[PDB]
Short mmCIF file of N, CA, C and O in Angstrom, two decimals:
data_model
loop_
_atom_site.label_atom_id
_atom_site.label_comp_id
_atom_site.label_asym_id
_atom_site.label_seq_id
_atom_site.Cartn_x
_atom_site.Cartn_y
_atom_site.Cartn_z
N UNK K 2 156.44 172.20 202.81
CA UNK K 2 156.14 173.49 203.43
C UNK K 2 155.02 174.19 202.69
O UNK K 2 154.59 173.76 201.62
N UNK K 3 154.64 175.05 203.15
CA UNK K 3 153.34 175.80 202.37
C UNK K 3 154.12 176.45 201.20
O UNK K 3 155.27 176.86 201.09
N UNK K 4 152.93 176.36 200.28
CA UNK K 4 153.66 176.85 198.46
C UNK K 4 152.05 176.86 198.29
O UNK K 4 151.07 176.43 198.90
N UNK K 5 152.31 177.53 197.22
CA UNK K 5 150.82 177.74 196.17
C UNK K 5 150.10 176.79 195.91
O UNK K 5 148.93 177.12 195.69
N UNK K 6 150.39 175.43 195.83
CA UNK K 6 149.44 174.50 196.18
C UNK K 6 148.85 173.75 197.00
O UNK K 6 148.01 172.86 196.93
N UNK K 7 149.39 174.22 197.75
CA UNK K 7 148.54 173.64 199.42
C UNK K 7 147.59 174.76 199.38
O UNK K 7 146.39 174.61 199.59
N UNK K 8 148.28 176.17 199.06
CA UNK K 8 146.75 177.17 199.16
C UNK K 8 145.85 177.01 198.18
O UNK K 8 144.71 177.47 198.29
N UNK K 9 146.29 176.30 197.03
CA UNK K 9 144.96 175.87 196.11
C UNK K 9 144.10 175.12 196.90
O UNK K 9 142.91 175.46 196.98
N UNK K 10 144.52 174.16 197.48
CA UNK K 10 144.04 173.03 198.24
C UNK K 10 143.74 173.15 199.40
O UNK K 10 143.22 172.21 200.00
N UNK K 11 143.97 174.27 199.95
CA UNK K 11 143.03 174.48 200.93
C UNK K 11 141.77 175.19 200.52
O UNK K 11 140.72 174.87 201.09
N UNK K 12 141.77 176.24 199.47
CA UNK K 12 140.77 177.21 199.24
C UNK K 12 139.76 176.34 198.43
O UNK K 12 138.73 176.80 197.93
N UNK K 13 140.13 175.17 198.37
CA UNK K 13 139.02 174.09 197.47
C UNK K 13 138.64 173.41 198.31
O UNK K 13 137.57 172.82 198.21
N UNK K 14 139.23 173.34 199.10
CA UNK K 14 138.56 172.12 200.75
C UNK K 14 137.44 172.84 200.95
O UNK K 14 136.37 172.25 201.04
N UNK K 15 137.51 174.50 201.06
CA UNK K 15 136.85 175.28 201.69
C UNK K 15 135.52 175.54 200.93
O UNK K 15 134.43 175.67 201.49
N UNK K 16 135.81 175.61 199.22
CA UNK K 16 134.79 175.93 198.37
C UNK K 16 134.02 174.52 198.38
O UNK K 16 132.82 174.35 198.17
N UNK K 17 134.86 173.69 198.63
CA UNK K 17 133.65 172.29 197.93
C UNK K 17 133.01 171.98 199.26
O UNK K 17 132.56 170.83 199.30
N UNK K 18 132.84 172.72 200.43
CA UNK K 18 131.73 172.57 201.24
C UNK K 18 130.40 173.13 200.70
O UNK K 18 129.25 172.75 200.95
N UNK K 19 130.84 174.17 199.87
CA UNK K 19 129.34 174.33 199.33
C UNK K 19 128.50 173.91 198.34
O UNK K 19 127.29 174.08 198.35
N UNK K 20 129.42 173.12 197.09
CA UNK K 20 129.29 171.84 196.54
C UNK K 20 128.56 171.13 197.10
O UNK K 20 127.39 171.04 196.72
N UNK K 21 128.95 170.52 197.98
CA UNK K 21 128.22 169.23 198.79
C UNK K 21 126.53 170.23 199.56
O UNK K 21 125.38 169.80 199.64
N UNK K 22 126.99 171.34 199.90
CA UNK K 22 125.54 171.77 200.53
C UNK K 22 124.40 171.80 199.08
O UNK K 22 123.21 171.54 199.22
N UNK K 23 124.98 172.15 197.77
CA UNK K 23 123.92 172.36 196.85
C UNK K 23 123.52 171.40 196.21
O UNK K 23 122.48 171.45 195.55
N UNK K 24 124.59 169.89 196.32
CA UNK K 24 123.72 168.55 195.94
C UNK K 24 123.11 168.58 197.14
O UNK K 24 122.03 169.18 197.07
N UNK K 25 123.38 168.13 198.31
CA UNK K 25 122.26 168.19 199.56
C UNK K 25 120.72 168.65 198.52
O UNK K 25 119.97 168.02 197.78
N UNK K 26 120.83 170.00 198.95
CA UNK K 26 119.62 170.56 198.21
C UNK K 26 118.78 170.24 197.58
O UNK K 26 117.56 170.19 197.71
N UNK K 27 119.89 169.89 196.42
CA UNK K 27 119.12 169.33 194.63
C UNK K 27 118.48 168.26 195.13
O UNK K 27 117.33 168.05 194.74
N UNK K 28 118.98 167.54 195.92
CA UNK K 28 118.63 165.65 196.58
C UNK K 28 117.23 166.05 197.14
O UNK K 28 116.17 165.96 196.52
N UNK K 29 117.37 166.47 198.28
CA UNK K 29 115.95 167.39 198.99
C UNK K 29 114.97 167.78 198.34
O UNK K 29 113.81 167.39 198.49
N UNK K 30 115.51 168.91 197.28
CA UNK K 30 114.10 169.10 196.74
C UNK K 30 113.76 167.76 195.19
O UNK K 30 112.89 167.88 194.32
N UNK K 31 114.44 167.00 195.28
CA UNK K 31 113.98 166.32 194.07
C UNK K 31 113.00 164.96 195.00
O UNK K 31 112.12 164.23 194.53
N UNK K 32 113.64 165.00 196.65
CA UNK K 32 112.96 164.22 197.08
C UNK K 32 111.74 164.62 197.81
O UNK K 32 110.98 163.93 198.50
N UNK K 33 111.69 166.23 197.44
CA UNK K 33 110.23 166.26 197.45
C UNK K 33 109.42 166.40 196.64
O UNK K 33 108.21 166.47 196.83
N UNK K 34 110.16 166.50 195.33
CA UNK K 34 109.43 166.38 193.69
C UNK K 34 108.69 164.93 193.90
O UNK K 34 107.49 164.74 193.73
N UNK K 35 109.52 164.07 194.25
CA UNK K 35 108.95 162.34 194.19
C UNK K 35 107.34 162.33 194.82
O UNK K 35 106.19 162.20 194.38
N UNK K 36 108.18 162.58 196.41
CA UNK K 36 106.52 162.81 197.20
C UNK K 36 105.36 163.70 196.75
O UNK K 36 104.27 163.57 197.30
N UNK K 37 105.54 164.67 195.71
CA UNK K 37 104.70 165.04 195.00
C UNK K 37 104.16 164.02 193.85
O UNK K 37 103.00 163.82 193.49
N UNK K 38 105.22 163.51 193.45
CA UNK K 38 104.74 162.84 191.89
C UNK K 38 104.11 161.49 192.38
O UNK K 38 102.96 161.12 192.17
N UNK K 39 105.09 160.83 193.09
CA UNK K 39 104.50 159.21 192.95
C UNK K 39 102.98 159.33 194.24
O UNK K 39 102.13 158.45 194.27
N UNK K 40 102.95 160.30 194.97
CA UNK K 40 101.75 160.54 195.75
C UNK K 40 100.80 160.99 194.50
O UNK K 40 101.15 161.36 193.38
N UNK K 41 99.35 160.84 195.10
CA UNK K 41 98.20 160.81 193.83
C UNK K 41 98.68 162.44 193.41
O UNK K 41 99.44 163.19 194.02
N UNK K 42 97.98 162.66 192.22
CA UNK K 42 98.18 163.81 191.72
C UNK K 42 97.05 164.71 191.02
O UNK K 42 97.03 165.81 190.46
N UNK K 43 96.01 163.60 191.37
CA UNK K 43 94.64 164.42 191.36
C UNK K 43 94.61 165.65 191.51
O UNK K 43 95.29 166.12 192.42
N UNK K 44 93.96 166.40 190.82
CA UNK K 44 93.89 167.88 190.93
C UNK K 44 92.53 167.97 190.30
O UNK K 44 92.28 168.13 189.11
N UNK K 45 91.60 167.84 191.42
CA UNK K 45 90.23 168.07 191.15
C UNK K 45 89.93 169.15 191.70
O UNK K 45 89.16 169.94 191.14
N UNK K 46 90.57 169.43 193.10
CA UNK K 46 90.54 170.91 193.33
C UNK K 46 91.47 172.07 193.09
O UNK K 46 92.68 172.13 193.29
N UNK K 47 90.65 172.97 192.62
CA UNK K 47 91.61 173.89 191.83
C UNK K 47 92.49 174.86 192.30
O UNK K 47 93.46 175.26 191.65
N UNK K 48 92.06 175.39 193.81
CA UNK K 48 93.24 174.90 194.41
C UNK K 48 94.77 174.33 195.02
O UNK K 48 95.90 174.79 195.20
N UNK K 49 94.15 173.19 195.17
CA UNK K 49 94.91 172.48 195.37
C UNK K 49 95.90 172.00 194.32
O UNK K 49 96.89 171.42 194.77
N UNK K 50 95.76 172.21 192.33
CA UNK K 50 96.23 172.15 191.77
C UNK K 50 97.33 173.36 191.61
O UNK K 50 98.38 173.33 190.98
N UNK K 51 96.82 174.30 192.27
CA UNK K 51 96.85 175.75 191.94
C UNK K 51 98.41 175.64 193.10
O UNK K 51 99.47 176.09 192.66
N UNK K 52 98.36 175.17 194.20
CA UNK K 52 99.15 175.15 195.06
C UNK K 52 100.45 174.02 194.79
O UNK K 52 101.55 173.97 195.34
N UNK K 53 99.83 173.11 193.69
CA UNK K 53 100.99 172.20 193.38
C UNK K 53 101.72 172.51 192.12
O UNK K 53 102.72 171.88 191.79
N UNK K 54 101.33 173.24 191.60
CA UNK K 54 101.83 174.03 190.15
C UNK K 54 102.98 174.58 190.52
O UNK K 54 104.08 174.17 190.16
N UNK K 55 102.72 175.91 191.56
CA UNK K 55 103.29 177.09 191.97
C UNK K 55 104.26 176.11 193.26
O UNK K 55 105.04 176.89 193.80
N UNK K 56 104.35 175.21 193.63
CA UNK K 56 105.41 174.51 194.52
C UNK K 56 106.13 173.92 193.10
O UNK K 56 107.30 174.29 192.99
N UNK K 57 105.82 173.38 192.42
CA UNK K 57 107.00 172.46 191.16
C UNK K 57 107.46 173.77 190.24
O UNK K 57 108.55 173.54 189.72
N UNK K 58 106.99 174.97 189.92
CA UNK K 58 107.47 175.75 189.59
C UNK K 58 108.87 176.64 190.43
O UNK K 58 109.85 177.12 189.85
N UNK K 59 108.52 176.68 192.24
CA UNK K 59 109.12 177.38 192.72
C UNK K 59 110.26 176.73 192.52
O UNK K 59 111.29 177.25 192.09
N UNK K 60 110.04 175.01 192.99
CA UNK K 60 111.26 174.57 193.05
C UNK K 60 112.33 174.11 191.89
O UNK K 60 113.37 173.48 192.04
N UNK K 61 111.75 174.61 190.72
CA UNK K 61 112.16 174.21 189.14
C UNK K 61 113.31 175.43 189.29
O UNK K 61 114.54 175.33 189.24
N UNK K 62 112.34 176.80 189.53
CA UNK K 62 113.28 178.39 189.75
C UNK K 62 114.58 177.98 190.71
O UNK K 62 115.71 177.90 190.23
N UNK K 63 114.29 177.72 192.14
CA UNK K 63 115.16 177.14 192.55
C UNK K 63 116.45 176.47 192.49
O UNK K 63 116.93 175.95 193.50
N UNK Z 507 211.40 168.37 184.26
CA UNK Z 507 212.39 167.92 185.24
C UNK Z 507 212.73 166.63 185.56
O UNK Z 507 212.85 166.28 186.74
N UNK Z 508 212.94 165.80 184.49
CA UNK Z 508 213.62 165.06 183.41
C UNK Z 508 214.86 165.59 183.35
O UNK Z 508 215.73 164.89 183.86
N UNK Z 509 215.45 167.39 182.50
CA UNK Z 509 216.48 167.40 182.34
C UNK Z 509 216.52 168.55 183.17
O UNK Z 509 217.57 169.17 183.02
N UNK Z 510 215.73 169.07 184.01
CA UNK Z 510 216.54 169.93 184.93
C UNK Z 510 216.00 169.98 186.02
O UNK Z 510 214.92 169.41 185.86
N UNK Z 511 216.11 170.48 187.49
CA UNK Z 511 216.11 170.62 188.96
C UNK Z 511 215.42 171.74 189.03
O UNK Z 511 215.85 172.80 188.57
N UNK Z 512 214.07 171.58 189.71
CA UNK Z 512 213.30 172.59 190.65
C UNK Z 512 213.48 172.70 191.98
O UNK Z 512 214.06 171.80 192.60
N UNK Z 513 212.97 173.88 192.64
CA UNK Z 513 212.79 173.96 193.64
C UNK Z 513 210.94 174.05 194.04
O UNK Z 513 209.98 174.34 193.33
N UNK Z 514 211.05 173.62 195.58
CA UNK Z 514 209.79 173.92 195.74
C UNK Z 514 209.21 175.16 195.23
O UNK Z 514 209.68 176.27 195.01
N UNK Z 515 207.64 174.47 195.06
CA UNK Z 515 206.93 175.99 195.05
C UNK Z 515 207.17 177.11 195.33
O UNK Z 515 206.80 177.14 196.51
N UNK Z 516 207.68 178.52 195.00
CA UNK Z 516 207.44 179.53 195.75
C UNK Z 516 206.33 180.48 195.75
O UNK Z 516 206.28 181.57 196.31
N UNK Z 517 205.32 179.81 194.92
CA UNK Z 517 204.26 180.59 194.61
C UNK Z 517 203.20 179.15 193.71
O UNK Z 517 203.57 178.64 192.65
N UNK Z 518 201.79 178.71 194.52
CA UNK Z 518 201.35 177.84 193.90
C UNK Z 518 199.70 178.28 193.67
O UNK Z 518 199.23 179.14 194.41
N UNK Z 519 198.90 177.72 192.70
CA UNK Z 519 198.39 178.54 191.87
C UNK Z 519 197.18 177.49 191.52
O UNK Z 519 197.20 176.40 192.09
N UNK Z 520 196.22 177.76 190.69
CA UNK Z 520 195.74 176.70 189.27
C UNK Z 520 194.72 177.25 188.87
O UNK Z 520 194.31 178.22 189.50
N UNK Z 521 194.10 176.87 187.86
CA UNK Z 521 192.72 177.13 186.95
C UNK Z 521 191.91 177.99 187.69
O UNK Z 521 191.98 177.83 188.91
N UNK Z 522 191.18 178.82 187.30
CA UNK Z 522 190.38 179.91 187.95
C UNK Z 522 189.58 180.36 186.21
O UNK Z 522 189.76 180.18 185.01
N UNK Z 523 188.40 181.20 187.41
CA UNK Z 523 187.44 181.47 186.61
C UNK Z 523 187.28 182.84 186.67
O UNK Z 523 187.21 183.37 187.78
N UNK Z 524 187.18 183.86 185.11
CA UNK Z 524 187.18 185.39 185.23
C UNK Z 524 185.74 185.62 184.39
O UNK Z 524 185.24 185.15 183.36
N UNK Z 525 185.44 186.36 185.14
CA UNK Z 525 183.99 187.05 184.46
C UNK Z 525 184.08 188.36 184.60
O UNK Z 525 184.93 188.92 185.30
N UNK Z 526 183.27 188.88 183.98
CA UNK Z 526 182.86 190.72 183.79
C UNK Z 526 182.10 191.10 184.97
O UNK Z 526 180.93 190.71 185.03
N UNK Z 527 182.60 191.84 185.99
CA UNK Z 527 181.92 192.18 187.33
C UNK Z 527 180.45 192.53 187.27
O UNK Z 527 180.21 193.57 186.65
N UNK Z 528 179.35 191.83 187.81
CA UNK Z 528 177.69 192.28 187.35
C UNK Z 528 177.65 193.85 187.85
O UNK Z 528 178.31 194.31 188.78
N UNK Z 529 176.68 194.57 186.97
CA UNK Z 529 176.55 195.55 187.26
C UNK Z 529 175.26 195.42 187.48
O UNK Z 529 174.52 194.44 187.56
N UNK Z 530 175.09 196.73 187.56
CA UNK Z 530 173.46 196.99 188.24
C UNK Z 530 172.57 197.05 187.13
O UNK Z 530 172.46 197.97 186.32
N UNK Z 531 171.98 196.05 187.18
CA UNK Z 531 171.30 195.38 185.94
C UNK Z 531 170.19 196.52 185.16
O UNK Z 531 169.20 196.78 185.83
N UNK Z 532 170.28 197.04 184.13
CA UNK Z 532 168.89 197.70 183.59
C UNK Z 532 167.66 196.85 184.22
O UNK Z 532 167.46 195.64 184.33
N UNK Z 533 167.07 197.80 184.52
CA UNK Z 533 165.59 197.77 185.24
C UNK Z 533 164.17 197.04 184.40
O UNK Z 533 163.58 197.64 183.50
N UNK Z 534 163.87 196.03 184.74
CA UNK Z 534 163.60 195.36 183.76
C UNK Z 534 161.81 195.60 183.98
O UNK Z 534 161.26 195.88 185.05
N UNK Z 535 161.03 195.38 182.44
CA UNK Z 535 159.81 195.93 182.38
C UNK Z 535 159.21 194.94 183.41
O UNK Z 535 159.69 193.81 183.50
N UNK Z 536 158.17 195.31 184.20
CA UNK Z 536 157.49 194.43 185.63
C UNK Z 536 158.42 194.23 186.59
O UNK Z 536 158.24 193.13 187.10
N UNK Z 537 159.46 194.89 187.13
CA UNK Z 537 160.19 195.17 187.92
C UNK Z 537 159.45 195.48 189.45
O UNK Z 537 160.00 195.25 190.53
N UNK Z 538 158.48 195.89 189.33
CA UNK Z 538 157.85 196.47 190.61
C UNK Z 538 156.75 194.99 190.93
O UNK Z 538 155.77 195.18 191.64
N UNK Z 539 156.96 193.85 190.46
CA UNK Z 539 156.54 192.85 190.94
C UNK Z 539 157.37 191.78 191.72
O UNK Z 539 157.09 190.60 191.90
N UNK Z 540 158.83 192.73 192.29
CA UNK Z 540 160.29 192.10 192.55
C UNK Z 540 160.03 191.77 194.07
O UNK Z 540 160.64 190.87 194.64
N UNK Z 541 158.86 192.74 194.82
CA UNK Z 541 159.58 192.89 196.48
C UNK Z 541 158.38 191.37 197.22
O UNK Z 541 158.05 191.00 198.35
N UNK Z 542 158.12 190.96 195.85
CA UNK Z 542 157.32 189.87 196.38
C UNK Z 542 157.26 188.64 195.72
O UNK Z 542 157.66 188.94 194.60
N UNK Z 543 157.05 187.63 195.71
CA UNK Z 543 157.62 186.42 195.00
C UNK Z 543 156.60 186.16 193.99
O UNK Z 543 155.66 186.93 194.20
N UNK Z 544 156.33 185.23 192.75
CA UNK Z 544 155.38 185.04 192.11
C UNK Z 544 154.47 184.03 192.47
O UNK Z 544 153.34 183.94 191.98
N UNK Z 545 154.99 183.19 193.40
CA UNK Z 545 153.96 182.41 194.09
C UNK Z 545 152.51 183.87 195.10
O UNK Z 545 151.30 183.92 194.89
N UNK Z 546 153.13 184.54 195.85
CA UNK Z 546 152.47 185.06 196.78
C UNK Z 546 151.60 186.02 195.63
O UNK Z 546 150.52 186.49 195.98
N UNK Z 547 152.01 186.22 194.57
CA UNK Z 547 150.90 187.35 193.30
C UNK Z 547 150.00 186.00 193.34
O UNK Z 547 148.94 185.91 193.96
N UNK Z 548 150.66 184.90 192.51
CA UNK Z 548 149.38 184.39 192.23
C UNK Z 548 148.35 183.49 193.71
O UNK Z 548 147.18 183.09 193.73
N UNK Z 549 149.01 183.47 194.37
CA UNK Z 549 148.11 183.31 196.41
C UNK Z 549 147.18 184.62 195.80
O UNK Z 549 146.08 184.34 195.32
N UNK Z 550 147.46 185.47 195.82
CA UNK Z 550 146.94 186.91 196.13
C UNK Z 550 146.00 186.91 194.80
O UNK Z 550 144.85 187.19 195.12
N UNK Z 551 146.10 186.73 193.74
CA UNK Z 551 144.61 186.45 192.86
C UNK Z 551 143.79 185.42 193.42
O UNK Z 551 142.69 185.66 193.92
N UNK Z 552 144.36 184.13 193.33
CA UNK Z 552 142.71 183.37 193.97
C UNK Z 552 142.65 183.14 195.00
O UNK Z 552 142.26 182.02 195.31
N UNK Z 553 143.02 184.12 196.07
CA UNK Z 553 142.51 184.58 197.31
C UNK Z 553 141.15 185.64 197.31
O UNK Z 553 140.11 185.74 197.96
N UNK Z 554 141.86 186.41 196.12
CA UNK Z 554 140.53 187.58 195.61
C UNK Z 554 139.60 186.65 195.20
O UNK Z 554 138.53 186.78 195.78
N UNK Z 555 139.68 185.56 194.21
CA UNK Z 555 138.84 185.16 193.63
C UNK Z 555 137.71 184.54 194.65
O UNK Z 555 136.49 184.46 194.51
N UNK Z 556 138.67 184.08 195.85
CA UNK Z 556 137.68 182.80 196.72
C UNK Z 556 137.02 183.97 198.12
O UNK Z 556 136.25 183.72 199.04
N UNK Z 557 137.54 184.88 197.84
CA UNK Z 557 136.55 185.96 198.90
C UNK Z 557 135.64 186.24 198.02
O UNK Z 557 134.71 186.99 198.32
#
């Protein structure tokens, strides 16, 4: 019958959906760290360095 | 009754148990946590916690 640990166990069913949404995330943005890194990384324009700094920074804050 | 003659029972009986009638118990310190069980206090913290 319901007792205090089924309501543990439900209120953790409930919390570890968001668990799973913030690895999601971490996965996402690390798989767009890759497509940054293993893509060239030339930064001849400054720019364009300027715009890849401030994206690996945002997503470091992140 | 070996050496002498009974009659039936006229009154039958046996072992029993006597205690001191409970009284109305001194009021004990956290008493006002009585009209609800200790499962449903602690439901009721990490319910707070998970809102």
């Amino acid at each position: 019958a319901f007792t205090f640990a089924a309501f543990c166990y439900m209120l953790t069913l409930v919390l570890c959906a968001s668990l799973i949404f913030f690895v999601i995330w971490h996965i996402i943005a690390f798989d767009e760290l890759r497509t940054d890194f293993k893509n060239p990384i030339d930064q001849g324009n400054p720019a364009r360095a300027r715009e890849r700094l401030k994206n690996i920074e945002r997503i470091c804050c992140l | 009754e070996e050496v002498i003659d009974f009659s039936k029972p006229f009154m039958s009986l046996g072992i029993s148990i006597m205690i001191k009638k409970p009284q109305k118990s001194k009021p004990g310190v956290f008493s006002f946590l009585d009209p609800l069980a200790y499962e449903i206090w602690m439901c009721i913290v990490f319910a707070y916690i998970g809102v």
